[model samples]
Target: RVSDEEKVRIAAKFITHAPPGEFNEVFNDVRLLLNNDNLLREGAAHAFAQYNMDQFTPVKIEGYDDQVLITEHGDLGNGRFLDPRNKISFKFDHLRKEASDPQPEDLKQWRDACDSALRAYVKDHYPNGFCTVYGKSIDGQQTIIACIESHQFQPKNFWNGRWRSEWKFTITPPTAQVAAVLKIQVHYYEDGNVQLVSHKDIQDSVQVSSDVQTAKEFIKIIENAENEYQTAISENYQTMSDTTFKALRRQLPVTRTKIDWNKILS
Candidate 1:
């Protein structure tokens, strides 16, 4: 009902004018102000999401758009929001009761079981890993997308060099195998403004059967694949840094049309 500007001003006013100490009073005031408006329950949900954001460390997904997060029953009928926080510890509500599609009690339970199983598995095995699942009913197929990620590793004192690897897999519709894409770059702004970046648009896929019905079976299938990739992805970073990046760091050998800095400076 309110613009971002209005909402931000409301949030700012609450913090600026509100008194110090007693959190109970603060929450009470927040509750009173939130309900006093014609905003209704959706307003309350919106206010709480802001509160939840404070406790989360945001994540960045390559091609992810502002599709409603893939969480519970949904965010105002447009449900399924992925809270892109590094540490997964927040819940959203079903806003706009009229728009809500009643998910079967048994079905939602099964979905939660799958979500929790993979989520916990990633947390335990992959270093600083997290996952969010999205279910879509389009045409004839019920496409389920599970996005999993990890913080992986950071080389000691390797601040000057950075490399990123993104590995995506689809099991439902079988396709050609594509390898991970590594984006390697060196950022050095010293005597030589050395800015080196190398990347290839490598399309690859992992071959697997989508035959699992239970959460346990599903987790096991991915566990094997991830174990295989963990070592490969880690080593992939090393090889790229030591070899590809090193090759880019050519000292002399000014071949072909090398620009004359002196002429350019004049």
Candidate 2:
């Protein structure tokens, strides 16, 4: 049985010995003991509170490595990802089939079809946005090419000081044994650098070899893929919208407005 003074000393020492940014992890064992029956728990809580050791506690997220430290008023994921306060999301649709050596012409044609479908879908739904080339560069390389792309706001001026979510997509061509596979990823800007938010690999939704053998068939498959992707985006957008609306509505002040009926029907 330790005295209050002795418990404080021990708790202070326990927290100080741990590495920085791991206070929460170290204290997790103690946090579980927060109950009336446990004198040790009360003592530990008091010691940390009195000694101001809670400030070192880390915010941890399940299923992700690295500790999170928030610097601004926004939803952050495991300190590595930033949630753009927008109603945008992504989905993927991949199609595969057994094939002999993939012909260059077929590859190019299939790639073009995917590009047109994705671009047209974005333009129709998100007219306020456009797609820009997302390329990677190498040392001293004359050209940097990327089949990857992300959607960005139009006019560029509206991007100033605003946190916008990015919708990125990549569709890979067929291999010798496996046909086309589409991968869609999502990201956002953090400290002026793009950071990954989420990603999904869409498995064989359409057979690329025999099903999409002609231009007409290719067009049909692309339309189906785009339609599925659009549906995913719409569902996620609605979820975010509803959540944001509910949260905002709860906090917003209510005020009665006087209606001017005399101006009506004039």
Candidate 3:
């Protein structure tokens, strides 16, 4: 256990002495120490409190708990910094080049692409069946695209009495190295509101950066993604029947609906 003064000296040494390219590695070690060594943690906290980290901004990603990489000037303290959990690494130059402030138009383009993909999927899978798939831009940062498909039922059934399934997909422009990333979730209506019950990461849902540059390539990626969506639906929701609904509704309040049982039967 070093004295508080010694701890400050050690923290200052790490903060000032490491070369730019090496700072991230040193910072990682310090972060680990902060988590592991009680004395180091206290000292580093004090050192950082006196020093300004305001000059640096935290790099963040949606749906992720930790930053992929962080850096500022190319000085000894600048460049990419990765956490210990970052096992999937990308080229620094590529990632840096891809980094940009979120733009509305970018999200719009992603929304359009996702819409086209969802339509193509419904066309191929549902054919003459009715399906509802749409895209929305979220805070100008990402696109939330969802598909509602009923098995062998008219759209009215879904609105009236059926518990239809919703497959949700969120699209965001890729990082410097990723072409795009899609988060898939499964949901259904319960008690008049949408409830997320389960989710999965479909393989190859996120196309790598190089593969999505061309329009054709992008379409191909979407189609592959659709396959995963279709499979999940087939495996999970296809078996849902009136019997299942009867049991489920008994457990949870049935969703608000337009169903008239006598009219439907008549």
Each candidate's number of clashing pairs is 14, 0, 2
Tens-digit lDDT track of model 3 for 66-180: 3332222111122222222222222232212332332222134443454455456545754332223333434654433333232222233221121122333444445311122
Lowest lDDT sum, 10 consecutive residues, model 3, at 70-79
Model 2 per-residue lDDT tens digits across residues 93-134: 100111122112103443344434544654565433332222
Q: lDDT for every model?
A: 0.43, 0.34, 0.38
Cα-based TM-score, every candidate: 0.36, 0.28, 0.27
Q: List the residue pairs that clash in candidate 2.
A: none
| Candidate 3, lDDT over the whole model | 0.38
In candidate 1, what residue range of length 10 has the lowest lDDT sum? Answer: 97-106
Q: Please name the candidate that would achieve the greatest TM-score relative to the true structure.
A: 1
- lDDT order of candidates, top first: 1, 3, 2
Better of 1 and 2 by lDDT: 1
Choose 2 or 3, whichever is better by TM-score.
2
Runs with alpha carbons beyond 4 Å of true place in candidate 2: 1-156, 160-198, 205-216, 244-249, 253-266
